[PDB]
Amino acid sequence: KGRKLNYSVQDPIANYEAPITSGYKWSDDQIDEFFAG
Amino acid sequence: GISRDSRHKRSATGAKRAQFRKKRKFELGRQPANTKIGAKRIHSVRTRGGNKKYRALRIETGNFSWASEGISKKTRIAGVVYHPSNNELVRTNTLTKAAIVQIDATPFRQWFEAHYGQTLKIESSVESQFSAGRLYACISSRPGQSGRCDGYILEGEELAFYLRRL
Amino acid sequence: MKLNISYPVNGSQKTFEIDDEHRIRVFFDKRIGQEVDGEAVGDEFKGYVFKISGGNDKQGFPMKQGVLLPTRIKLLLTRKRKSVRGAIVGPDLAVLALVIVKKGEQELEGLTDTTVPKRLGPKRANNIRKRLQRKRHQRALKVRNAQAQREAAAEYAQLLAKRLSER
Amino acid sequence: VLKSTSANDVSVYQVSGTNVLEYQNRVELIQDFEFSEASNKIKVSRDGQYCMATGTYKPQIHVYDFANLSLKFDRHTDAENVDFTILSWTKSVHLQNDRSIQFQNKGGLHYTTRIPKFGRSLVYNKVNCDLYVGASGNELYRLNLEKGRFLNPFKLDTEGVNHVSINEVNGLLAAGTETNVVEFWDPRSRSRVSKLYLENNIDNRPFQVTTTSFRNDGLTFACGTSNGYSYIYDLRTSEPSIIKDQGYGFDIKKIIWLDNVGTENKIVTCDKRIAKIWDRLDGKAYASMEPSVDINDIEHVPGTGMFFTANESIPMHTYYIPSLGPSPRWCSFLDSIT
Amino acid sequence: QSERAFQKQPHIRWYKNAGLGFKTPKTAIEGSYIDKKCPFTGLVSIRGKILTGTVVSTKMHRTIVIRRAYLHYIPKYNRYEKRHKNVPVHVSPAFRVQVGDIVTVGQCRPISKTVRFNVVKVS
Amino acid sequence: AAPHHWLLDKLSGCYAPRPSAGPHKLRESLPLIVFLRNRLKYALNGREVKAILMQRHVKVDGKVRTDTTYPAGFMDVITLDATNENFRLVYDVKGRFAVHRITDEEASYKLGKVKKVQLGKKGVPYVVTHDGRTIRYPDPNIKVNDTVKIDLASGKITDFIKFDAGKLVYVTGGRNLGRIGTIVHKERHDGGFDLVHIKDSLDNTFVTRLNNVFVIGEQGKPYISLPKG
RNA sequence: AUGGUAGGAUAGUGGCCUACCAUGGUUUCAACGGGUAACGGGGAAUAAGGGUUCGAUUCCGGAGAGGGAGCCUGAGAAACGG
RNA sequence: AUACAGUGAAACUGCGAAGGCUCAUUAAAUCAGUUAUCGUUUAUUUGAUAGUUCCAUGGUAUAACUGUGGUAA
């Protein structure tokens, strides 16, 4: 289990991308009233 | 592939501060060509003068050998069920050396009916495949180096030697 | 535009500087190999048909037969990035090459009525139409090579047999 | 004028087939489209050019510029690939047959990391940026591109997963397992929401679901199998489905929608030899795309009616449908030749 | 004697002899042990030089860690500081070597990263 | 830039002649330019030794072999047509190449240490020597380090000298290089310092290797003639 | 990390790389680590008929052909010339 | 010398260049000798080393070359 699942932090991917604020065009209330069931 | 050198790794003493060298030509690791089933395509690569090397990727016509008489005859490939040099290799169904792959044994039927007359002394758990058609057989030749698929059939002892495993 | 035209069997070829581009516009958006009529490029050459065979544009860049995209693009040829114009002919060709495969209604005092001959007759025997002493010596040296080597090999294998009998 | 195969009252064309006067009337679209005797996986980027085709022996990356009709480069990667995605333009992430993951850049090979078990699929999340990678076993991992950490891997069932996909407009993480359960996780909560089971009427052997897909309405889900049987799903009475047996039926690998061009409610299915296309709400085949060799996978270019396969031969086939749509702006004389 | 797959067998029960003054025990000529890299049946051939010494540890299987103290005529501080050496070595079906046990080995065909020697004698 | 064996004077030049490839190794041979030009001095420079090589006077091992850097190693009988020059060159007692002059019945042959006997292909016994004369079919009792006698008109072994205790041996290699006397002792070890030991004027003792020693005859009767002082 | 079994790649030997397994291995008989008159040293070599550590040379370490990356050629290369 | 016949610009060919500067500091891992490769590659050097045949000579496709041209190149 040596090289298997190193839970470390890696240098070039720490800022490889950037997030997005709104993201999903739905609402989270639309998620809840989408899969209530 | 990458390499063949001890310089990138530690010895039996535990050393450090490697930072050694730009890797040479003679540390040449080529890419692992996982040979599969397809239409027969062998890449003719060069090494060490005119040392052509046959890198087989999609070979079919396996020359598999009847064991008790040693009759290497031509057949097709189905799939490897057990090969724990990589247990994902049988999930992806490739074809490497020392794998146990299945064969439609119809030319072995033809040879038995041709040099014995009748159809069916040989073991019963391979007589079941004599009847059905698919027999287990293990690859001997190296398609990644010699480009060929040769092998030997499973007959009795080696059969149970693998059937108790998987 | 300039139109290079070639009558191949007579061996004739000449360029013609044709202005007045609505005569030219018959060739537009027709790639290499597709034929054409004389009727919409000219009136004085009617019943004419030309298979186009490429052409250098202004800036001299050639077109290779059958890719796409009648602007210029950067491909990999005999392997390095060479610039090559697309096979389709548009408004911005300098010269355009043509092969006339049927004479129509007017004789041409450049193409039809004047012609050149070929170069020179054939040289090979079968090309003119359409040693045995070496065959003696090859066979004699071959049978002599056999009668030397394949006898000398057994002639020292018998010496091995003498050593084995004496041992 | 390129020849057309017979179909149900409809026409398709191939460019760069096994058969494709012909030398002097060549119809070659993309120069140097041929690989080393097979093809791994082809997909077209989000913008209007730059398609990427993974390699076969000494596997490469093969980015083709559509506005140059030829090859840009071929980064011979270290191992043979199975799955990758593209992250806009120049960045892309790959995973090979061994449990390693490559990050290609403009300069190429920005990093090589690994996952602890052998992986089978990768998808990227546009929202908060964590790639989900499906592998063998209890383990569906994350590599977040925000801060480069690892995340608390998603606990699966026994054997594993063949394909993972997230929904686009709302994010519903699919994971096609082996025991017919589809295991929908929530990309918000990092927990399960449902464990939907797949049924049939033939039941040859215990099939495994191999292909998952969604579209940009966020209500339906396209499901596959290891038998050649397409499935549709909705939340509306989610226990049954509509099914599609295919006439050969080995393993369907690519099921993709037509949710961004005209001639709507249509979907492409693709198993090992054939790729067909049918309509929703009836289940009747619009067309099919029978090549001369097997198919490793396919892809469909957005906005227009063309398809790009990755197969087991030397070139790759492109399939143009002049009834589904036109040919794109960089192929804008395909409608003039055929 | 079969705890792994892939037809554990000799590779052409089988028996040979390296010669050169080293015996082959009768179970290693005709016995059920496979002798994959034990040089008496083996696949390896013998060459090189032969070294002798006692052991330190035989903890893992197919690892015989020899010690080798030897005389060297030191001229610097004119006294002999005592030598010590180590070498890992594969097993043989002739002696379960415990602590002590001066044994000797012959050079052949690198088996792991650091072993070129395999046991040929116990005394 | 020179070795010790050539007897090469230091006031000669800057670049030393590397021998080309050939029968013997680089480290146990002298080429023809350092033989003819600056040892027994039939030339004055490389131009005229190439001139007499183009004239083809040299007849080493019965063949002409017109080359400047041809590596004449141990006891290749250099034969020169004018003034019937027959030269067998052996080792002296301090490491150089002593070139003895011999006669025609002695230059009609040479001898060679056998290196290995092989069942190579198709049932053919097989023998090699330091010039690599792969000659057919000796007796089965050719061990390693015995001595064949080459025919030098054809290639066949004519006589054979068995390596055992009580044979006249020549040592070419290590710190015993070029000694004769072959009897104080015999000691075959199992991988090194294994040999037959050689006497001196006071019958001193010496240690060498098996491959660094090879037999030339018997205790008083070698059919090679040897130089003296 | 240390070894075992098999495969991959090799010019082939080789945990060189990967699956599985065992928890090993070096060390006070000096492990592993600390620096320079490591522009100096180690015979690396010629020695000179009196210069006694000046006094002949091979090599400081590996790289580089604007910068990392990928590929190709050849008996030999990750080419001063693609 | 009425199918070749000497000078020979420019083209194919055989080979040529067959081993040259600067920059950051490695403690028998850089180096030197040595053991071995039935554990391996090898142009050139050298010695050796080939046995299957039913009812007078095989095909177009490219140069150089001519000819028509484009482009500032």
From Swiss-Prot, chain A:
Family: Belongs to the AATF family.
Induction context: Up-regulated during cold stress and following nutrient replenishment by dilution of cells fron exhausted to fresh minimal medium.
Domain of life: Eukaryota
Gene: BFR2
More about this protein: Present with 15400 molecules/cell in log phase SD medium.
Function of the protein: Involved in endoplasmic reticulum to Golgi transport. Involved in a protein-transport step blocked by brefeldin A, which disrupts the Golgi apparatus and its incoming protein flux. May also be involved for mass growth or cell proliferation.
UniProt-recorded name of the protein: Protein BFR2
Localization per Swiss-Prot or TrEMBL: Nucleus, Nucleolus
Species of origin: Saccharomyces cerevisiae (strain ATCC 204508 / S288c) (Baker's yeast)
From Swiss-Prot, chain B:
GO biological process, one term: translation
Modified residue annotations for Phosphothreonine: T61, T106
Gene behind the chain: RPS8A
Subcellular location: Cytoplasm
CDD domains, sorted: Ribosomal_S8e_like
Organism (species): Saccharomyces cerevisiae (strain ATCC 204508 / S288c)
Keywords of this entry: Cytoplasm, Phosphoprotein, Ribonucleoprotein, Ribosomal protein
Region (Disordered): 1-30
InterPro entries per record: Ribosomal_eS8, Ribosomal_eS8_CS, Ribosomal_protein_eS8_euk, Ribosomal_Se8/biogenesis_NSA2
Its job: Component of the ribosome, a large ribonucleoprotein complex responsible for the synthesis of proteins in the cell. The small ribosomal subunit (SSU) binds messenger RNAs (mRNAs) and translates the encoded message by selecting cognate aminoacyl-transfer RNA (tRNA) molecules. The large subunit (LSU) contains the ribosomal catalytic site termed the peptidyl transferase center (PTC), which catalyzes the formation of peptide bonds, thereby polymerizing the amino acids delivered by tRNAs into a polypeptide chain.
Top-level taxon of the source organism: Eukaryota
Protein name: Small ribosomal subunit protein eS8A
UniProtKB/Swiss-Prot annotation, chain C:
Main subcellular localisation: cytoplasm
Gene3D superfamilies: 1.20.5.2650
One GO BP: translation
UniProt-annotated location(s): Cytoplasm; Nucleus, Nucleolus
Keyword entries, A-Z: Cytoplasm, Isopeptide bond, Nucleus, Phosphoprotein, Ribonucleoprotein, Ribosomal protein, Ribosome biogenesis, rRNA processing, Ubl conjugation
Matching InterPro entries: Ribosomal_eS6, Ribosomal_eS6-like, Ribosomal_eS6_CS
Record-linked SMART domains: Ribosomal_S6e
GO cellular component: 90S preribosome; cytosol; cytosolic small ribosomal subunit; nucleolus; nucleoplasm; small-subunit processome
Cytoplasm keyword on record: yes
Molecular functions (GO terms): structural constituent of ribosome
PROSITE patterns, alphabetized: RIBOSOMAL_S6E (PS00578)
Function per UniProt: Component of the ribosome, a large ribonucleoprotein complex responsible for the synthesis of proteins in the cell. The small ribosomal subunit (SSU) binds messenger RNAs (mRNAs) and translates the encoded message by selecting cognate aminoacyl-transfer RNA (tRNA) molecules. The large subunit (LSU) contains the ribosomal catalytic site termed the peptidyl transferase center (PTC), which catalyzes the formation of peptide bonds, thereby polymerizing the amino acids delivered by tRNAs into a polypeptide chain.
Family, as annotated: Belongs to the eukaryotic ribosomal protein eS6 family.
Alphabetical list of PANTHER family matching this protein: 40S RIBOSOMAL PROTEIN S6
Name listed for the protein in its UniProt record: Small ribosomal subunit protein eS6A
Organism: Saccharomyces cerevisiae (strain ATCC 204508 / S288c) (Baker's yeast)
Lineage summary: Eukaryota, Fungi, Dikarya, Ascomycota, Saccharomycotina
Curated annotation (Swiss-Prot), chain E:
First-listed, main subcellular location of the protein, grouped into a coarse class: cytoplasm
PROSITE patterns, A to Z: RIBOSOMAL_S17 (PS00056)
Protein name: Small ribosomal subunit protein uS17A
GO annotation, biological process: maturation of SSU-rRNA from tricistronic rRNA transcript (SSU-rRNA, 5.8S rRNA, LSU-rRNA); ribosomal small subunit assembly; translation
Superkingdom: Eukaryota
Annotated gene: RPS11A
Family: Belongs to the universal ribosomal protein uS17 family.
Gene3D superfamilies per the UniProt record, alphabetical: 2.40.50.1000
Role according to the record: Component of the ribosome, a large ribonucleoprotein complex responsible for the synthesis of proteins in the cell. The small ribosomal subunit (SSU) binds messenger RNAs (mRNAs) and translates the encoded message by selecting cognate aminoacyl-transfer RNA (tRNA) molecules. The large subunit (LSU) contains the ribosomal catalytic site termed the peptidyl transferase center (PTC), which catalyzes the formation of peptide bonds, thereby polymerizing the amino acids delivered by tRNAs into a polypeptide chain.
Cross-link (Glycyl lysine isopeptide (Lys-Gly) (interchain with G-Cter in ubiquitin)): K8, K26, K36, K37, K59, K76, K85, K113, K121
Molecular function as annotated in GO: rRNA binding; structural constituent of ribosome
